[PDB]
Write an enzyme that holds these catalytic residues in place. Structure first.
Site, PDB file in Angstrom:
ATOM      1  N   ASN A   1       0.811  -1.233   0.000  1.00  0.00           N
ATOM      2  CA  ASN A   1       0.000   0.000   0.000  1.00  0.00           C
ATOM      3  C   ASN A   1       0.848   1.289   0.000  1.00  0.00           C
ATOM      4  O   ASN A   1       0.289   2.374   0.184  1.00  0.00           O
ATOM      5  CB  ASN A   1      -0.960   0.046   1.198  1.00  0.00           C
ATOM      6  CG  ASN A   1      -1.551  -1.279   1.579  1.00  0.00           C
ATOM      7  OD1 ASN A   1      -1.447  -1.708   2.733  1.00  0.00           O
ATOM      8  ND2 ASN A   1      -2.161  -1.966   0.615  1.00  0.00           N
TER       9      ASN A   1
ATOM     10  N   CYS B   1       5.111   7.344   9.603  1.00  0.00           N
ATOM     11  CA  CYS B   1       6.178   8.032   8.899  1.00  0.00           C
ATOM     12  C   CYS B   1       5.932   7.873   7.395  1.00  0.00           C
ATOM     13  O   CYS B   1       5.640   6.776   6.927  1.00  0.00           O
ATOM     14  CB  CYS B   1       7.536   7.474   9.318  1.00  0.00           C
ATOM     15  SG  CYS B   1       8.928   8.038   8.310  1.00  0.00           S
TER      16      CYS B   1
ATOM     17  N   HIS C   1       3.047   2.225   2.270  1.00  0.00           N
ATOM     18  CA  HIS C   1       3.270   2.749   3.613  1.00  0.00           C
ATOM     19  C   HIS C   1       4.486   2.075   4.251  1.00  0.00           C
ATOM     20  O   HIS C   1       4.713   0.885   4.019  1.00  0.00           O
ATOM     21  CB  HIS C   1       2.036   2.523   4.493  1.00  0.00           C
ATOM     22  CG  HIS C   1       0.869   3.364   4.098  1.00  0.00           C
ATOM     23  ND1 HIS C   1       0.909   4.744   4.205  1.00  0.00           N
ATOM     24  CD2 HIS C   1      -0.333   2.997   3.601  1.00  0.00           C
ATOM     25  CE1 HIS C   1      -0.263   5.173   3.765  1.00  0.00           C
ATOM     26  NE2 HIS C   1      -1.046   4.159   3.393  1.00  0.00           N
TER      27      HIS C   1
END
Ligand SMILES: O=C(O)COc1ccc(F)cc1
Ligand SMILES: O=C(O)COc1ccc(F)cc1
Lengths: 263, 265
Positions: free
Chosen positions: A185, A222, A187
């Site tokens: 995804n 983050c 991330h």
């Protein structure tokens, strides 16, 4: 792997690979963290998923709020480690996922982990209190009676972590995630934060000690274009207080503690 | 896995894992590079090694990668079984060569192939030396005697001369440092890391619209744990080609140079 006889937990065997071990010829805590993540995805897939159709129509995801891992023996390169995992409801707070690590040959518990997950809108990023329709669709896959990898009364998996005060004793600054640190995804995966937290531990402690416990609190995600500073202070067996924060503004992304034993 | 019936090659099946796939739900070139490394380690172990010979340990000699070339036709998806076959060969006194073939376990079609050239070196002085006659006989009993090449073609792209990227680079990723996860069991930066570092300077737009078909990487110098790398790219070209350069952030010392070929999705 496969679900156990009752269908209320999942088991999988893994052979430790050459590129998965450190300078001691045993699996790194990041390989273990990856294996727990992998056995949790296969459990979610084997029971039809870990978002449900109720959460898909609402853009809702499960995010890790806290991870705690205790290792007694690290598997060596070529060893078979068997991992058992299961989920549980924590009222309207969220869900919990537990893991037990064993030697496939001796059947001995060589480690255990626990993680707390919370609900959140994928887009607005706000933490929702878990509803009632969401319980009536994932409780049919969870043990009805409590099953905890860390059942102990007053255990170290539910400890309050303080914030590291400046100046930090040790630090690793300018850490950026690469494309290999991002999941399907895009991330930054939760294993990268573990690696980033351990980057500020002195090479001397790493060479003479072995990581026994790690507890990590996740406060903010983050991004790919973000830069992280990793900070450590000895608080003691050797204990450390940890803090991940954005290189710029000093925005807190993570805080934790580690416990190391002499080799 | 296991050695094949003749004992002159090794095979292993791998199931692609969730953390091993990218945004397209298929294995990354770094997962493939890791699997090739893993299948090569098990082949070395299955025939009595730890990949140094008894004469190599006696003289502090190691095999170092001089060049890697990988071509992927189809990337395995998360949950697919990919079977990899590997074998070694003597390249006279120059060094050794290791080849790989990647297949779909279900259909048996070749979905990729790789070739790498290794050279002999003193572990301490870092001095590359020619393979002696004694070392050659210790590993020729485990290698096919007749030539067996993953890239047999009379005009293949695995023996191409790579030029040096001229400044200014079109694209770049500055300040790359290896972490503890980038180091192997001997505390050296794993060869797969250089592949990830080379791909860091490819624009996210090319990555999102294209798939990596070919990569050729020339290794010139070993990067240390406390070193900092700069990754540089320039488009040289439906197909997109790039010239690559890894160099030390400070002095600009060359550590790697290569080329990539990408095809539209
Ligand atoms: O993406 C963000 O900004 C929020 O990240 C969180 C991560 C873990 C949490 F328990 C809460 C929030
Ligand atoms: O450590 C050094 O300076 C030498 O590294 C090399 C790496 C790969 C080579 F094919 C040759 C040399």
């Amino acid at each position: 792997g496969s679900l156990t006889e009752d269908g209320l937990s999942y088991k999988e065997k893994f052979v430790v690979r050459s590129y998965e071990v450190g300078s001691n010829k045993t699996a790194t805590v990041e390989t273990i963290a990856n294996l727990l993540q992998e056995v949790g995805c296969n459990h979610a897939q084997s029971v039809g998923f870990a978002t449900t159709t109720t959460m898909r129509k609402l853009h809702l995801i499960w995010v890790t709020a806290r991870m705690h891992i205790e290792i007694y023996k690290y598997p060596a390169w070529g060893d078979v480690v068997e991992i058992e995992t299961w989920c549980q409801s924590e009222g309207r707070i969220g869900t919990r996922r537990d893991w037990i690590l064993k030697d496939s040959v001796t059947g001995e518990v060589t480690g255990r982990a626990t993680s707390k997950w919370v609900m959140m809108n994928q887009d607005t990023r706000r933490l929702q209190k878990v509803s009632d329709d969401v319980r009536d669709e994932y409780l049919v896959f969870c043990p009805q009676e409590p099953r905890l990898a860390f059942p102990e009364e007053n255990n170290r998996s539910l400890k309050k972590i303080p914030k590291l005060e400046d100046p930090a004793q040790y630090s690793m600054i300018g850490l950026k995630p690469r494309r290999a640190d991002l999941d399907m995804n895009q991330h930054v995966n939760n294993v990268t934060y573990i690696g980033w937290v351990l980057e500020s531990i002195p090479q001397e402690i790493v060479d003479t000690h072995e990581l026994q416990v790690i507890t990590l609190d996740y406060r903010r995600e983050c991004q790919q274009d973000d830069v992280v500073d990793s900070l450590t202070t000895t608080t003691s067996d050797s204990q450390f207080l940890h803090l991940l924060r954005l290189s710029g503004d000093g925005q807190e992304i993570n805080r934790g503690t580690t416990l190391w034993r002499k080799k």
